[PDB]
Amino acid sequence: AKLAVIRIRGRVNVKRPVRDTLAMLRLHRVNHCVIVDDTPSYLGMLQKAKDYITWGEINAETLAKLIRKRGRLIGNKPVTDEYVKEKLGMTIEEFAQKVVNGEMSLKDLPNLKPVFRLHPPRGGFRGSKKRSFKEGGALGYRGEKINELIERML
Amino acid sequence: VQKAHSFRRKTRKKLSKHPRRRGLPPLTRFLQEFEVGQRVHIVIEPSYHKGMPDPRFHGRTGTVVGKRGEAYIVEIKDGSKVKTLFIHPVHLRPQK
RNA sequence: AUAGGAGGGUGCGGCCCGAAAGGAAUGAGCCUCCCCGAAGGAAACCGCGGCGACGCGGGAGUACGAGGGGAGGGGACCGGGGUUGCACCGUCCGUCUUGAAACACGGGGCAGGGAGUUCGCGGCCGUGGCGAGGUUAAGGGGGUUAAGCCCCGUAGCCGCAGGGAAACCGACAUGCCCGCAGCCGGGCUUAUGCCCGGUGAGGGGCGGGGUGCGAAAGCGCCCGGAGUCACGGCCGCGAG
RNA sequence: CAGGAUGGCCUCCCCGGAGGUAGGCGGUGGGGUAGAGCACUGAUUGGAGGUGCAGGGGGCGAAAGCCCCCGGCCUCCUGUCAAACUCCGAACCCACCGCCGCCGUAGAUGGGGGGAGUAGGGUGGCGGUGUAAGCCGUCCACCGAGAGGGGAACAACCCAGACCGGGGUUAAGGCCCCAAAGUGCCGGCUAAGUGUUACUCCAAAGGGUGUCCCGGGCCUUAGACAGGUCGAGGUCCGGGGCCCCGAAAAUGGACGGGGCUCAAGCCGGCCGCCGAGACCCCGGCGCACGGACCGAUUGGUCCGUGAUCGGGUAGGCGGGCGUGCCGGUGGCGUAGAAGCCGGGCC
RNA sequence: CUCAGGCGGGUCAGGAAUCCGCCGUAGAGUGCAAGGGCAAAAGCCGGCCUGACUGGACCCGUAACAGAGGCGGGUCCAGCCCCGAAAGGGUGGCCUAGCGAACCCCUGUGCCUCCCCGGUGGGGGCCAGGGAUGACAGAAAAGCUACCCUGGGGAUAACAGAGUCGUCUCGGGCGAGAGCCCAUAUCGACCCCGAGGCUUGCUACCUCGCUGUCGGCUCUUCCCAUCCUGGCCCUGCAGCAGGGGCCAAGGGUGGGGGUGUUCACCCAUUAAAGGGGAACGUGAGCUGGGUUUAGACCGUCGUGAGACAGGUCGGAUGCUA
RNA sequence: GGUACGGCGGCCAUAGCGGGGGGGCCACACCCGGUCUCAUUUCGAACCCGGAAGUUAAGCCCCCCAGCGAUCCCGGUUGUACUGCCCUCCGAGAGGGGGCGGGAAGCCGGGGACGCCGCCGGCCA
């Protein structure tokens, strides 16, 4: 499946291994989101950097909304229905559905960058950024509940 | 008190041998052969004192770059520089 | 003359000055009206869930929103400056030090003066001339108000052949293999572009050669032509 | 040994062309730490059994010797150990391979050249030492060389890494007043102003029919305990939460202060709101890289990419501002030059 | 060929002399510390020998990563050899310690060379071995300063502050034991848990371009772990008195001898003649007896200059707020 | 192709130690004698030379065991001891704790285990 990963903690008091892991995950700043595969390598990277990120499974509807709102092309240009139809012949909803189902990867939209720069959540995070989501914080594996966070951050 | 590094410095357990492994080893390791470009581990045999590499390198994997006499030439990467060692095959092991 | 912080910072309000150099009667502060609008973003009202704080769906992505435009009214101020009031913040400057507001050192005020300079040798780089050659020193001749200007001056220095303590001997103007740029042929490709094949200056790896040690093998150094002069700059050693 | 040199770490330029590896997954190998254990070495309480074994006390002697306590050695049972022990043994770390991820033809890895500064470190976790403070190493996280928002102030703790003008939302944490946001909601506890302290920067052994609970044994609702008569739960034991005693200091005074008792304290949870230069959006500046144009020497204009550019001490590199004199070029001035006081504009 | 140690047997012979069997994973040995390695051996016993040699190449360690003179080690080529039937082994000791630059000198061995040329005596040069610097990456090397001077350091001691509380003062837990019986009227062994910062010590955090020492006099103030004064409780409290404890810091806590003394000792009174903090309160308030310069004497030590937390005599105290 | 036959080996105890039963086509042994080859720091004990009168008693070969030793699997102790990363979580302190990721040693009980492979010959066929 496809996993959405959001960086939570900042860039200070982070040791070199985790810093490099996050850099390779392309989460250079806070409130940044990426979509990755569910392969063992990526799972190991998430396990390594689990104390500064949260992640979960993303629905087709949430992926489509994220692409339409925060999806940006090279040059920080908006992703438009005209452009998506021209370069794929399908709507953003069908593109997201196919991506989630695994028919093809986001990389098949030309000039689309892998990073979504989300907005701070409405009402803030419902837990401290120093404890895992299971305990009641905001870090660690979140499951399907990451869709609510994605909605609150667009 | 600072102590300089010697050949057998702090090797009491590294160069020790199992009580049930005493005596000379089987001859297969003695008579094994390698080819240029092969990768070989370095596992020192305490009972054979000739052609022994420095225990500093015990447990590392190197590349065979030739063979002079009965000893194989193993090229290893210490830090960033390249080091050449001459090791009897009894101390070497193939990488599967 | 009831008020506390290194004497300042951000924002504005009193009082005062505002001819020129700043805007402005070809119209200032100001007042009224219309349009678009990013991130963001209500409420009235109605239905439902929770013991409760409250929340969910419609209202609605509506009202509003940085900023971007248009129209009408009025008719002389806005910008700027001095001082002071209020709200919040702010424990001076240079210095050694792990650590300076420091009960660590140097600090009454103002004006002038004040601290990587010159030569010799060596290593580099930026640029320019000539180029298997480069360059003159001392000095000489012409001309001139003059020490400027013009011409000569091969002594010398470095480079052209390296090895060796010395005696002494004394080498590729290319015999092969990879190969970047570039060029040529083909395919994909709207074009830049990508892939493949050949050739490939420069660059790299072999082969062969000179010399020292060696009985020899074999090793060290060197060999298929780029150096020299000049101006400026950085550093090294010696001179204070 | 308050000083130098060679390295490590920084900066600037060049060549050389197709790979590289801080993180992850699997695999091929190495290890002897934590823990554990007695199989080696060395310790360690008692009981049983067997051994004259050159112990030692005695009985027992012309000599040859035996009869018991006690010492030693061996086996078993029982109760304990090891930084300089190991029959075993992790987490974890290291080398090499294949792949994912990231960087690289806008030139990495790597190589040559020029210039440095650095030879007192501190806090924080771990290891050896020390009564402790501390001393000495190790980890590279923060200060040194670091803004802004908080913990009352604080170097190190929390959020957070910063070009300029604006709008919004969050972070640490906070919401009775100082002070922006709740005298917010549900169940329970404390009566001590205990507390109102994340850490920097908070006193114990022992004890409490003080209270709120959870387990277990005896009796066990007119049958239990207190005084064979009453007539409903009694009598014990081990535990959990809060509080109490144990608890004495010197200028007058510290939960930051006022103050607070179904809290404005504490335990288990929840619902709103407030709050940064962080994150999002709009406009502007510069820098890095690539591209197209014009200027007769280092220069100028515009376009494209930047989530993967914008703090900074020692130090390295680039551009620019200002002063005296000289060779040129173009000029100003007694209708008022230089200089000097106040003011406007870039 | 197999060791140490042990069991059973045997004339002298015994615990132990030399011998015969069985068991025996090394419990022996391996030149020397320790670790590692060694059983038809690397140990014990013998035969032969001198590879503990000559001319060279490359590589690892000292010195990881990451630079190095000198040195040690490893893998090899060639020459001449040793053992062995052969393979195979030999460049010292089974591996890790036992050692050292420049200049100069000595020895070996063959060559090159010395100013116009040649011979001779002698010298110079290349290669190899050797003589040492233990402060061991290599000076040739004794002291006092109180007559001292200079540049610095709070990178570093003494007084004072700060941290700590081993030590010191004080308190608590259990209760063996002593108390005619009775652990708790009184004392409280062995052991264990704490407070203070009033003794000493430890650390080296601030202060060395100066924060002027001990004691005494003067003066102000504060704490209670209370000596007297006020009020109480237990008692092995008859009274008069004693022992222990509690509340209580308003008041008092004095005068003298020797000694610089703080302190401690002593005297006569007294209700008692308590202990402590304030830069060990108080020198821009005082005094200067001691400490601690420059002069001098004695004892001891030193060859001497001289020194002594050993004595003794003398030895400066700045001020216009 | 058969063989209670040997020689050379690989892993080097799950293969060892200690026990019980069975065998001698060939073959392996014990065994007989020391002129010669060879040797005793004496010894034909070992080593060597010459053979088959006798024996399967021993070695050797085949089958069996769980007494000692070794080691493999399953269950319990047990996700116990220990440990990597984050933490404004609890403690006066020592030290503990929450989330994610690893995970023993010894002991108890039940099975396994008295070796498995390679090459070539002898005898028979």
PDB file of all heavy atoms in Angstrom, chain C residues 40 80 99 202 235, chain D residues 17 116 155 168 344:
ATOM      1  P     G C  40      -5.693  27.409   3.722  1.00  0.00           P
ATOM      2  OP1   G C  40      -5.358  26.087   4.304  1.00  0.00           O
ATOM      3  OP2   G C  40      -6.577  27.484   2.535  1.00  0.00           O
ATOM      4  O5'   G C  40      -6.329  28.301   4.877  1.00  0.00           O
ATOM      5  C5'   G C  40      -5.584  28.601   6.046  1.00  0.00           C
ATOM      6  C4'   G C  40      -6.102  29.831   6.748  1.00  0.00           C
ATOM      7  O4'   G C  40      -6.217  30.935   5.815  1.00  0.00           O
ATOM      8  C3'   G C  40      -7.488  29.730   7.355  1.00  0.00           C
ATOM      9  O3'   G C  40      -7.500  29.039   8.589  1.00  0.00           O
ATOM     10  C2'   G C  40      -7.901  31.191   7.475  1.00  0.00           C
ATOM     11  O2'   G C  40      -7.334  31.789   8.631  1.00  0.00           O
ATOM     12  C1'   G C  40      -7.253  31.801   6.229  1.00  0.00           C
ATOM     13  N9    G C  40      -8.219  31.983   5.130  1.00  0.00           N
ATOM     14  C8    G C  40      -8.328  31.291   3.952  1.00  0.00           C
ATOM     15  N7    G C  40      -9.305  31.720   3.197  1.00  0.00           N
ATOM     16  C5    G C  40      -9.873  32.759   3.918  1.00  0.00           C
ATOM     17  C6    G C  40     -10.965  33.613   3.620  1.00  0.00           C
ATOM     18  O6    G C  40     -11.686  33.628   2.616  1.00  0.00           O
ATOM     19  N1    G C  40     -11.195  34.531   4.638  1.00  0.00           N
ATOM     20  C2    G C  40     -10.468  34.616   5.797  1.00  0.00           C
ATOM     21  N2    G C  40     -10.819  35.557   6.679  1.00  0.00           N
ATOM     22  N3    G C  40      -9.451  33.827   6.084  1.00  0.00           N
ATOM     23  C4    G C  40      -9.211  32.931   5.110  1.00  0.00           C
ATOM     24  P     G C  80       7.211  60.180   8.159  1.00  0.00           P
ATOM     25  OP1   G C  80       7.961  58.907   8.262  1.00  0.00           O
ATOM     26  OP2   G C  80       6.101  60.454   9.102  1.00  0.00           O
ATOM     27  O5'   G C  80       8.263  61.370   8.271  1.00  0.00           O
ATOM     28  C5'   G C  80       9.451  61.361   7.497  1.00  0.00           C
ATOM     29  C4'   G C  80      10.201  62.665   7.606  1.00  0.00           C
ATOM     30  O4'   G C  80       9.362  63.758   7.146  1.00  0.00           O
ATOM     31  C3'   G C  80      10.612  63.092   9.006  1.00  0.00           C
ATOM     32  O3'   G C  80      11.772  62.434   9.479  1.00  0.00           O
ATOM     33  C2'   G C  80      10.785  64.593   8.846  1.00  0.00           C
ATOM     34  O2'   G C  80      12.008  64.903   8.196  1.00  0.00           O
ATOM     35  C1'   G C  80       9.633  64.920   7.901  1.00  0.00           C
ATOM     36  N9    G C  80       8.418  65.290   8.646  1.00  0.00           N
ATOM     37  C8    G C  80       7.270  64.553   8.779  1.00  0.00           C
ATOM     38  N7    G C  80       6.365  65.141   9.511  1.00  0.00           N
ATOM     39  C5    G C  80       6.959  66.338   9.884  1.00  0.00           C
ATOM     40  C6    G C  80       6.464  67.398  10.682  1.00  0.00           C
ATOM     41  O6    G C  80       5.367  67.496  11.237  1.00  0.00           O
ATOM     42  N1    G C  80       7.396  68.418  10.807  1.00  0.00           N
ATOM     43  C2    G C  80       8.641  68.423  10.240  1.00  0.00           C
ATOM     44  N2    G C  80       9.395  69.503  10.481  1.00  0.00           N
ATOM     45  N3    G C  80       9.114  67.442   9.496  1.00  0.00           N
ATOM     46  C4    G C  80       8.225  66.442   9.360  1.00  0.00           C
ATOM     47  P     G C  99      34.453  31.564  26.699  1.00  0.00           P
ATOM     48  OP1   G C  99      34.005  32.009  25.360  1.00  0.00           O
ATOM     49  OP2   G C  99      35.813  31.910  27.169  1.00  0.00           O
ATOM     50  O5'   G C  99      33.393  32.085  27.764  1.00  0.00           O
ATOM     51  C5'   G C  99      32.014  31.779  27.626  1.00  0.00           C
ATOM     52  C4'   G C  99      31.308  31.797  28.957  1.00  0.00           C
ATOM     53  O4'   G C  99      31.888  30.795  29.833  1.00  0.00           O
ATOM     54  C3'   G C  99      31.418  33.089  29.751  1.00  0.00           C
ATOM     55  O3'   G C  99      30.502  34.083  29.325  1.00  0.00           O
ATOM     56  C2'   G C  99      31.187  32.614  31.178  1.00  0.00           C
ATOM     57  O2'   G C  99      29.805  32.415  31.435  1.00  0.00           O
ATOM     58  C1'   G C  99      31.889  31.261  31.166  1.00  0.00           C
ATOM     59  N9    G C  99      33.285  31.354  31.625  1.00  0.00           N
ATOM     60  C8    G C  99      34.367  31.720  30.871  1.00  0.00           C
ATOM     61  N7    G C  99      35.483  31.720  31.542  1.00  0.00           N
ATOM     62  C5    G C  99      35.113  31.333  32.820  1.00  0.00           C
ATOM     63  C6    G C  99      35.899  31.153  33.983  1.00  0.00           C
ATOM     64  O6    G C  99      37.118  31.307  34.124  1.00  0.00           O
ATOM     65  N1    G C  99      35.125  30.752  35.063  1.00  0.00           N
ATOM     66  C2    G C  99      33.773  30.550  35.032  1.00  0.00           C
ATOM     67  N2    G C  99      33.211  30.165  36.184  1.00  0.00           N
ATOM     68  N3    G C  99      33.028  30.716  33.953  1.00  0.00           N
ATOM     69  C4    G C  99      33.759  31.105  32.890  1.00  0.00           C
ATOM     70  P     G C 202      47.958  13.949 -27.420  1.00  0.00           P
ATOM     71  OP1   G C 202      49.409  14.244 -27.424  1.00  0.00           O
ATOM     72  OP2   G C 202      47.502  12.540 -27.486  1.00  0.00           O
ATOM     73  O5'   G C 202      47.331  14.604 -26.113  1.00  0.00           O
ATOM     74  C5'   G C 202      47.628  15.944 -25.760  1.00  0.00           C
ATOM     75  C4'   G C 202      46.692  16.470 -24.701  1.00  0.00           C
ATOM     76  O4'   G C 202      45.315  16.342 -25.144  1.00  0.00           O
ATOM     77  C3'   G C 202      46.705  15.750 -23.364  1.00  0.00           C
ATOM     78  O3'   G C 202      47.801  16.102 -22.539  1.00  0.00           O
ATOM     79  C2'   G C 202      45.357  16.140 -22.783  1.00  0.00           C
ATOM     80  O2'   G C 202      45.380  17.467 -22.279  1.00  0.00           O
ATOM     81  C1'   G C 202      44.478  16.101 -24.030  1.00  0.00           C
ATOM     82  N9    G C 202      43.839  14.782 -24.185  1.00  0.00           N
ATOM     83  C8    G C 202      44.001  13.859 -25.184  1.00  0.00           C
ATOM     84  N7    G C 202      43.291  12.780 -24.997  1.00  0.00           N
ATOM     85  C5    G C 202      42.628  13.005 -23.801  1.00  0.00           C
ATOM     86  C6    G C 202      41.712  12.199 -23.077  1.00  0.00           C
ATOM     87  O6    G C 202      41.284  11.075 -23.357  1.00  0.00           O
ATOM     88  N1    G C 202      41.287  12.827 -21.913  1.00  0.00           N
ATOM     89  C2    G C 202      41.691  14.069 -21.498  1.00  0.00           C
ATOM     90  N2    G C 202      41.177  14.514 -20.345  1.00  0.00           N
ATOM     91  N3    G C 202      42.538  14.828 -22.160  1.00  0.00           N
ATOM     92  C4    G C 202      42.959  14.235 -23.291  1.00  0.00           C
ATOM     93  P     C C 235      49.591  37.630   3.128  1.00  0.00           P
ATOM     94  OP1   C C 235      48.838  37.787   4.424  1.00  0.00           O
ATOM     95  OP2   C C 235      50.366  38.790   2.558  1.00  0.00           O
ATOM     96  O5'   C C 235      50.601  36.409   3.288  1.00  0.00           O
ATOM     97  C5'   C C 235      50.219  35.245   4.003  1.00  0.00           C
ATOM     98  C4'   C C 235      51.001  34.035   3.559  1.00  0.00           C
ATOM     99  O4'   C C 235      51.227  34.076   2.131  1.00  0.00           O
ATOM    100  C3'   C C 235      52.400  33.900   4.123  1.00  0.00           C
ATOM    101  O3'   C C 235      52.417  33.458   5.467  1.00  0.00           O
ATOM    102  C2'   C C 235      53.036  32.921   3.147  1.00  0.00           C
ATOM    103  O2'   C C 235      52.617  31.592   3.414  1.00  0.00           O
ATOM    104  C1'   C C 235      52.414  33.374   1.825  1.00  0.00           C
ATOM    105  N1    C C 235      53.325  34.278   1.092  1.00  0.00           N
ATOM    106  C2    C C 235      54.520  33.700   0.434  1.00  0.00           C
ATOM    107  O2    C C 235      54.718  32.535   0.491  1.00  0.00           O
ATOM    108  N3    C C 235      55.457  34.581  -0.297  1.00  0.00           N
ATOM    109  C4    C C 235      55.232  36.004  -0.375  1.00  0.00           C
ATOM    110  N4    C C 235      56.197  36.804  -1.111  1.00  0.00           N
ATOM    111  C5    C C 235      54.034  36.588   0.292  1.00  0.00           C
ATOM    112  C6    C C 235      53.085  35.706   1.030  1.00  0.00           C
TER     113        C C 235
ATOM    114  P     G D  17      39.121  12.628 -18.862  1.00  0.00           P
ATOM    115  OP1   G D  17      39.692  11.940 -20.044  1.00  0.00           O
ATOM    116  OP2   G D  17      38.040  13.626 -19.044  1.00  0.00           O
ATOM    117  O5'   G D  17      38.619  11.507 -17.852  1.00  0.00           O
ATOM    118  C5'   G D  17      37.720  10.496 -18.286  1.00  0.00           C
ATOM    119  C4'   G D  17      36.606  10.269 -17.296  1.00  0.00           C
ATOM    120  O4'   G D  17      36.473  11.440 -16.445  1.00  0.00           O
ATOM    121  C3'   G D  17      35.235  10.037 -17.923  1.00  0.00           C
ATOM    122  O3'   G D  17      34.499   9.084 -17.160  1.00  0.00           O
ATOM    123  C2'   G D  17      34.580  11.411 -17.830  1.00  0.00           C
ATOM    124  O2'   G D  17      33.169  11.390 -17.819  1.00  0.00           O
ATOM    125  C1'   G D  17      35.151  11.937 -16.518  1.00  0.00           C
ATOM    126  N9    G D  17      35.200  13.401 -16.434  1.00  0.00           N
ATOM    127  C8    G D  17      35.669  14.257 -17.397  1.00  0.00           C
ATOM    128  N7    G D  17      35.591  15.511 -17.058  1.00  0.00           N
ATOM    129  C5    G D  17      35.027  15.487 -15.794  1.00  0.00           C
ATOM    130  C6    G D  17      34.698  16.554 -14.923  1.00  0.00           C
ATOM    131  O6    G D  17      34.845  17.766 -15.104  1.00  0.00           O
ATOM    132  N1    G D  17      34.147  16.092 -13.736  1.00  0.00           N
ATOM    133  C2    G D  17      33.939  14.776 -13.426  1.00  0.00           C
ATOM    134  N2    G D  17      33.392  14.537 -12.228  1.00  0.00           N
ATOM    135  N3    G D  17      34.240  13.771 -14.230  1.00  0.00           N
ATOM    136  C4    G D  17      34.780  14.195 -15.391  1.00  0.00           C
ATOM    137  P     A D 116      49.510  31.334   5.490  1.00  0.00           P
ATOM    138  OP1   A D 116      49.696  32.309   6.590  1.00  0.00           O
ATOM    139  OP2   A D 116      50.693  30.819   4.759  1.00  0.00           O
ATOM    140  O5'   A D 116      48.716  30.076   6.054  1.00  0.00           O
ATOM    141  C5'   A D 116      48.262  30.040   7.398  1.00  0.00           C
ATOM    142  C4'   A D 116      46.863  30.586   7.517  1.00  0.00           C
ATOM    143  O4'   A D 116      45.965  29.816   6.684  1.00  0.00           O
ATOM    144  C3'   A D 116      46.237  30.518   8.899  1.00  0.00           C
ATOM    145  O3'   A D 116      46.646  31.588   9.732  1.00  0.00           O
ATOM    146  C2'   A D 116      44.747  30.532   8.593  1.00  0.00           C
ATOM    147  O2'   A D 116      44.290  31.854   8.358  1.00  0.00           O
ATOM    148  C1'   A D 116      44.689  29.754   7.278  1.00  0.00           C
ATOM    149  N9    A D 116      44.316  28.337   7.447  1.00  0.00           N
ATOM    150  C8    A D 116      45.030  27.248   7.022  1.00  0.00           C
ATOM    151  N7    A D 116      44.456  26.103   7.279  1.00  0.00           N
ATOM    152  C5    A D 116      43.276  26.459   7.908  1.00  0.00           C
ATOM    153  C6    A D 116      42.222  25.693   8.430  1.00  0.00           C
ATOM    154  N6    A D 116      42.192  24.359   8.397  1.00  0.00           N
ATOM    155  N1    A D 116      41.188  26.349   8.994  1.00  0.00           N
ATOM    156  C2    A D 116      41.221  27.685   9.025  1.00  0.00           C
ATOM    157  N3    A D 116      42.157  28.514   8.568  1.00  0.00           N
ATOM    158  C4    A D 116      43.170  27.832   8.012  1.00  0.00           C
ATOM    159  P     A D 155      23.347  31.983  32.182  1.00  0.00           P
ATOM    160  OP1   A D 155      24.311  30.897  32.480  1.00  0.00           O
ATOM    161  OP2   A D 155      23.777  33.397  32.310  1.00  0.00           O
ATOM    162  O5'   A D 155      22.780  31.768  30.707  1.00  0.00           O
ATOM    163  C5'   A D 155      23.609  31.936  29.563  1.00  0.00           C
ATOM    164  C4'   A D 155      23.524  30.751  28.630  1.00  0.00           C
ATOM    165  O4'   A D 155      24.868  30.294  28.333  1.00  0.00           O
ATOM    166  C3'   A D 155      22.793  29.542  29.186  1.00  0.00           C
ATOM    167  O3'   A D 155      22.222  28.803  28.109  1.00  0.00           O
ATOM    168  C2'   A D 155      23.918  28.746  29.834  1.00  0.00           C
ATOM    169  O2'   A D 155      23.647  27.371  29.985  1.00  0.00           O
ATOM    170  C1'   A D 155      25.072  28.994  28.864  1.00  0.00           C
ATOM    171  N9    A D 155      26.398  29.010  29.481  1.00  0.00           N
ATOM    172  C8    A D 155      26.751  29.341  30.765  1.00  0.00           C
ATOM    173  N7    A D 155      28.040  29.297  30.985  1.00  0.00           N
ATOM    174  C5    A D 155      28.572  28.934  29.758  1.00  0.00           C
ATOM    175  C6    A D 155      29.885  28.716  29.319  1.00  0.00           C
ATOM    176  N6    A D 155      30.952  28.837  30.098  1.00  0.00           N
ATOM    177  N1    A D 155      30.080  28.366  28.033  1.00  0.00           N
ATOM    178  C2    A D 155      29.012  28.239  27.245  1.00  0.00           C
ATOM    179  N3    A D 155      27.728  28.416  27.537  1.00  0.00           N
ATOM    180  C4    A D 155      27.575  28.766  28.824  1.00  0.00           C
ATOM    181  P     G D 168      -4.196  38.654  10.633  1.00  0.00           P
ATOM    182  OP1   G D 168      -5.519  38.969  11.222  1.00  0.00           O
ATOM    183  OP2   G D 168      -2.956  39.037  11.350  1.00  0.00           O
ATOM    184  O5'   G D 168      -4.146  37.087  10.343  1.00  0.00           O
ATOM    185  C5'   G D 168      -5.245  36.429   9.735  1.00  0.00           C
ATOM    186  C4'   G D 168      -4.926  35.001   9.371  1.00  0.00           C
ATOM    187  O4'   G D 168      -3.674  34.933   8.648  1.00  0.00           O
ATOM    188  C3'   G D 168      -4.729  34.033  10.525  1.00  0.00           C
ATOM    189  O3'   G D 168      -5.953  33.584  11.076  1.00  0.00           O
ATOM    190  C2'   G D 168      -3.915  32.915   9.886  1.00  0.00           C
ATOM    191  O2'   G D 168      -4.754  32.018   9.174  1.00  0.00           O
ATOM    192  C1'   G D 168      -3.055  33.685   8.883  1.00  0.00           C
ATOM    193  N9    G D 168      -1.671  33.902   9.340  1.00  0.00           N
ATOM    194  C8    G D 168      -1.113  35.066   9.801  1.00  0.00           C
ATOM    195  N7    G D 168       0.150  34.945  10.101  1.00  0.00           N
ATOM    196  C5    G D 168       0.447  33.622   9.814  1.00  0.00           C
ATOM    197  C6    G D 168       1.663  32.903   9.938  1.00  0.00           C
ATOM    198  O6    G D 168       2.761  33.303  10.338  1.00  0.00           O
ATOM    199  N1    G D 168       1.522  31.581   9.534  1.00  0.00           N
ATOM    200  C2    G D 168       0.360  31.021   9.069  1.00  0.00           C
ATOM    201  N2    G D 168       0.414  29.728   8.728  1.00  0.00           N
ATOM    202  N3    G D 168      -0.778  31.680   8.952  1.00  0.00           N
ATOM    203  C4    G D 168      -0.664  32.968   9.337  1.00  0.00           C
ATOM    204  P     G D 344      15.038  67.089   7.725  1.00  0.00           P
ATOM    205  OP1   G D 344      13.732  66.585   8.215  1.00  0.00           O
ATOM    206  OP2   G D 344      16.280  66.337   8.023  1.00  0.00           O
ATOM    207  O5'   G D 344      14.930  67.261   6.145  1.00  0.00           O
ATOM    208  C5'   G D 344      13.738  67.747   5.549  1.00  0.00           C
ATOM    209  C4'   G D 344      13.825  67.774   4.042  1.00  0.00           C
ATOM    210  O4'   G D 344      14.977  68.547   3.621  1.00  0.00           O
ATOM    211  C3'   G D 344      14.017  66.439   3.344  1.00  0.00           C
ATOM    212  O3'   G D 344      12.821  65.687   3.236  1.00  0.00           O
ATOM    213  C2'   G D 344      14.593  66.857   1.999  1.00  0.00           C
ATOM    214  O2'   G D 344      13.577  67.324   1.126  1.00  0.00           O
ATOM    215  C1'   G D 344      15.471  68.041   2.399  1.00  0.00           C
ATOM    216  N9    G D 344      16.886  67.666   2.564  1.00  0.00           N
ATOM    217  C8    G D 344      17.612  67.641   3.727  1.00  0.00           C
ATOM    218  N7    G D 344      18.850  67.277   3.549  1.00  0.00           N
ATOM    219  C5    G D 344      18.951  67.051   2.185  1.00  0.00           C
ATOM    220  C6    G D 344      20.056  66.634   1.402  1.00  0.00           C
ATOM    221  O6    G D 344      21.205  66.373   1.771  1.00  0.00           O
ATOM    222  N1    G D 344      19.725  66.528   0.057  1.00  0.00           N
ATOM    223  C2    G D 344      18.487  66.793  -0.464  1.00  0.00           C
ATOM    224  N2    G D 344      18.358  66.633  -1.786  1.00  0.00           N
ATOM    225  N3    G D 344      17.447  67.178   0.255  1.00  0.00           N
ATOM    226  C4    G D 344      17.749  67.289   1.563  1.00  0.00           C
TER     227        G D 344
END
